[PDB]
Write a protein that binds this DNA or RNA. Structure first.
Ligand SMILES: [Mg+2]
Lengths: 82, 96, 106, 95, 96, 87, 106, 95
DNA sequence: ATCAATATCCACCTGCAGATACTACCAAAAGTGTATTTGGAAACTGCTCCATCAAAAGGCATGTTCAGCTGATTCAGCTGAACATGCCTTTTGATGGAGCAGTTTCCAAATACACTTTTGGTAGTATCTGCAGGTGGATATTGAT
DNA sequence: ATCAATATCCACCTGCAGATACTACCAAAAGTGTATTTGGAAACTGCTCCATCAAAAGGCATGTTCAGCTGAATCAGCTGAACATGCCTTTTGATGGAGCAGTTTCCAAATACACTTTTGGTAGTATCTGCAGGTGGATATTGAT
């Protein structure tokens, strides 16, 4: 049952996310819109983290690589070091 | 033979997921998506376990708040149903 | 030999704060009082958050502060919320809040 | 092996002063530590810029104070400033 | 006695202001406003004129971009008239 | 010198026509009558914030004159970097 | 006596850039390639913006680039627009742009 | 009567290279000057942090390069990298 | 209204993940003490540019009129919410080995310094030119009919 | 459609401030050529913790069904655009001094080793407990009637 990775972000899980966000009713097109958006977000952050990974000459993306990339994208995260 | 009205369960779920703080996307499908995306920038990559977690916390925080703004955009248009145009407006005004 | 923290009345480490400033490339030089002031400010904001977080633990029948509490502490307080307006507290969730037009007719 | 430093013990000392019967989870302590490090960097960075703007080679308590006023919202700034001025008084009037 | 229809002069002004770059708020009044707001923070302040011009350039560009966002909030509500609720939705989404 | 004259209500120098112009530049076709006071309010908050930070730099430097650089640095802090004035 | 600029094949001033890196306290030490590489990047970017602004001058039957030209150049280019996404160019105005629903008739 | 430096003469040189018959107004130049200082501080800052994150006390061409890939969008980064790599290559061979 | 299906509550119980607590220990900070260097406040004062003032240049305030937009009302259709009914993916745990992180070495590249040359800025007096703003006349758009 | 009111175009022109051009000058920048220090790369290496996979756990996919939302169409009430009118305030341009900025002086405070003491972090163990996740049972909520 070959399935895309982005599709592993499923309807019910997007629907939960929305609920945490206070959303009551959701149109069928939201799920595909949401995946597009999540992909863009992960591209942007991962690119930066990986660029830190490469700079330090590692093969392993660290929590610090991610944290530092979140910081420069204006998405400071507390909880994972730094 | 018993059915809740459309919107009652939705409310019940809003109350429930605002009470709690667990991540709402399954870890593995998230892990694959991350790895798939990173592959376009570097081949043969490992990820610390905490690295992938940090990324999930951030993506979920981001998607939840965008759903808030989106919801405000739907309400502005005098609706209660969120649509792609609401998400799009929210992203446009955030400067994304 | 009395530490600079105990001299200044502080639980937070003045010497460390000083070392972190020198080795931080903020300026060529670091005055004697700057670490002291900095460390006090830091102690203070920490107390302010642990204060409110602790209260929040109390209100939830809990004696152990968890991320959820730090989150409620911060987002329920106008000034801390602004300070941390672009910050995500991992495992914090959000504030209970439903837009009123979404409430069923009563 | 390499020593991994943290404000954890100082945050705990402050916790016990403000809520003597409340403890903290590791994850919450990790958040507090990020918080201290973050506020550190913001205040230092702002002080750095200040000194550069005025062609001075030294960060003093005066720079830390303007940095604090620039960074913290109203009441937080006020109490931070008075906490900071106090700690420097005690520090001086003490051999 | 000719009369352009409602809308026609408005579009003509959009075209004209969008093509030029001169500041649109009168200078001296804007300067008095700056001085008054400043005076309330601190007395006995003087201002370099380029300090006043810098504020004006910034304030005018801030406000022009805020109207674009406001316009898109109105249009989303299926109107062509900006209202206070549009500005407020723009500012909320912007995280102001 | 002798008594510098009282400054009050200058917010009203931001006229209905000048606000309408800014809306034009901003692409706006039609404008509800309540927009003028709303905009004045939004502008005042914007100027308070920038001026507060500018004045903070002036005082730090022990000057009586707010400089273009004071404003440029306050603009940068605020995420509204301005080119053209010593940036 | 060669300048480090001529040595590196650049118009932009490598000594200056080295000096400015030292006075800025970015690090204890500044490597010898750093100002050369940084000066090239800076020279490049100003060439990119001048190319484009130059074109907007020409498109507007003018010979002297003014700030409106810089703004046209920057906002009409996806990438310069992004790099300067949080920047205001004094005396730049905006791009001509009118939302569709606003045009007359059908 | 102290002297204020700017990139004007270099900006100007570069302008003659791309558009030999085009001038630049002094206001336009003040903007180009702001633009170069701005990208300067932004790149140097990323490089500063980067060095720090890696417990490196030296800022090399390698730090500037990463700073450039973190700061600039796709195509601009790609071209900037080239020009910087080739200026260094050339600089190194010239001695 | 009442009636019953289901959700939600509170009290009490417990087991073990997560937290506190211990202690030899030990390196590397942090404090101390002495020797040296320098940054920046103070006192003086040259000189820019800011506050302030009067003469006309030229947008703003207000009332009237009515075009057309907003927002209420109604209504039918399609679209999501709910909730059955099954399976297939995710989570959890166990175990090799990849690679990151620690440590030690040594040299290429770094800072330091003194002394010599070049350059970019400014000042002063120079004449040069792009375009803003004025004109008028040719064409385009707009809206009544 | 036509007509005619008014905006728009662009082409041509003269004035001038803003740009460009030039020589004399210099302080501070930059380059050059030594003497001396060292950051980080290389190479080797021990040990996490990462990717893997198999066993247990469990949530999501699908289809039927219909409540209730979204959006269309219709309309009136009234807001907001356009424009005529009257006239006041901002724009601009020229002098007197407040304060900023450039000197030089010099000591209170900084850095720079070197040297003695301590504390904060880790590891090994052992020790402890807050509370998540069951349970029963009482009532509240929702939705049919
Ligand atoms: Mg006042």
């Amino acid at each position: 049952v070959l399935r895309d990775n982005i599709q592993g972000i499923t309807k019910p899980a997007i629907r939960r996310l929305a609920r945490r966000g206070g959303v009551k009713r959701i149109s069928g097109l939201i799920y595909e819109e949401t995946r597009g958006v999540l992909k863009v977000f992960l591209e942007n952050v991962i690119r930066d983290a990986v660029t830190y990974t490469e700079h330090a000459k590692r093969k392993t993306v660290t929590a610090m690589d991610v944290v530092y990339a979140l910081k420069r994208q204006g998405r400071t995260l507390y909880g994972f070091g730094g | 033979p018993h059915r809740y009205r459309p919107g009652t369960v939705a409310l019940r779920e809003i109350r429930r997921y605002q009470k709690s703080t667990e991540l709402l996307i399954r870890k593995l499908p998230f892990q694959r998506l991350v790895r798939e995306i990173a592959q376009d920038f570097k081949t043969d990559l490992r990820f610390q376990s905490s690295a992938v977690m940090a990324l999930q916390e951030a993506s979920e925080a981001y998607l939840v708040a965008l759903f808030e703004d989106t919801n405000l955009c739907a309400i502005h248009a005098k609706r209660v149903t969120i649509m792609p145009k609401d998400i799009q407006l929210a992203r446009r005004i955030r400067g994304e | 030999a009395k530490t600079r923290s105990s001299r200044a009345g502080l639980q937070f480490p003045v010497g460390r704060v000083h070392r972190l400033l020198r080795k931080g490339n903020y300026a060529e030089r670091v005055g004697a009082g700057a670490p002291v002031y900095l460390a006090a400010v830091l102690e203070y904001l920490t107390a302010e958050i642990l204060e409110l977080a602790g209260n929040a633990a109390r209100d939830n029948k809990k004696t152990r502060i968890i991320p959820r509490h730090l989150q409620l502490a911060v987002r329920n307080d106008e000034e801390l919320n602004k300070l941390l307006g672009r910050v995500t507290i991992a495992q914090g969730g959000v504030l209970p809040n439903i837009q009123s037009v979404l409430l069923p007719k009563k | 092996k390499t020593r991994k430093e943290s404000y954890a013990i100082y945050v705990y000392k402050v916790l016990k002063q403000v809520h003597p019967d409340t403890g903290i989870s590791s994850k919450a302590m990790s958040i507090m530590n990020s918080f201290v490090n973050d506020v550190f960097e913001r205040i230092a960075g702002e002080a750095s810029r200040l000194a550069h703007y005025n062609k001075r080679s030294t960060i003093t308590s005066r720079e830390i104070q303007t940095a604090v006023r620039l960074l913290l919202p109203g009441e937080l700034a006020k109490h931070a400033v008075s906490e900071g001025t106090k700690a420097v008084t005690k520090y001086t009037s003490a051999k």
